[PDB]
Amino acid sequence: MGSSHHHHHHSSGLVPRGSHMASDPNRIIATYISNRQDAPTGNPDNIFDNNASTELVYKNPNRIDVGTYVGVKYSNPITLNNVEFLMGANSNPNDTMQKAKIQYTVDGREWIDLEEGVEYTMPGAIKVENLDLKVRGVRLIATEARENTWLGVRDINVNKKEDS
Numbered sequence: 001m002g003s004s005h006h007h008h009h010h011s012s013g014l015v016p017r018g019s020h021m022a023s024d025p026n027r028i029i030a031t032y033i034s035n036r037q038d039a040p041t042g043n044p045d046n047i048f049d050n051n052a053s054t055e056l057v058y059k060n061p062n063r064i065d066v067g068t069y070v071g072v073k074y075s076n077p078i079t080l081n082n083v084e085f086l087m088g089a090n091s092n093p094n095d096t097m098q099k100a101k102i103q104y105t106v107d108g109r110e111w112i113d114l115e116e117g118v119e120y121t122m123p124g125a126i127k128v129e130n131l132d133l134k135v136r137g138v139r140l141i142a143t144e145a146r147e148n149t150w151l152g153v154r155d156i157n158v159n160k161k162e163d164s
Helices: none
Strands: 056-058 078-080 083-086 100-105 111-113 133-142 151-153 155-158
Touching (some): 111 133
Antiparallel strands (some): 078 133, 100 111
């Protein structure tokens, strides 16, 4: 129980030792995010697998003002090279953001601006480059969504055979 003074390490005690370090998987998962608590129309695999063969569209709530956004979160802070949300609309190509840029969380907590002040209200295929920066998850950020609207998704992947 500690010989000399110490008052434990900061707060928590025990002997964490380290981060284990043994069988480095080097694999990061990508969970789909969405301001709309809905279920994937068919299969979000287009994102989880990055194939763009299955369908995916959020809509449950046919009305949302500000905050409406989606993308894909990771498992932990990694070294990203470039993300690209390749999505459009479910039925009508005019079904997506109202006006906004893309987002991304750094410490897997807060989410800050990502792409230029573009209006991802008419985005067909989202993709960015020269984004070599560690990041946590990925997602778009709306500033004034529209009512009676859905979210058509085709395929979104991070580091799709890029890693640079």
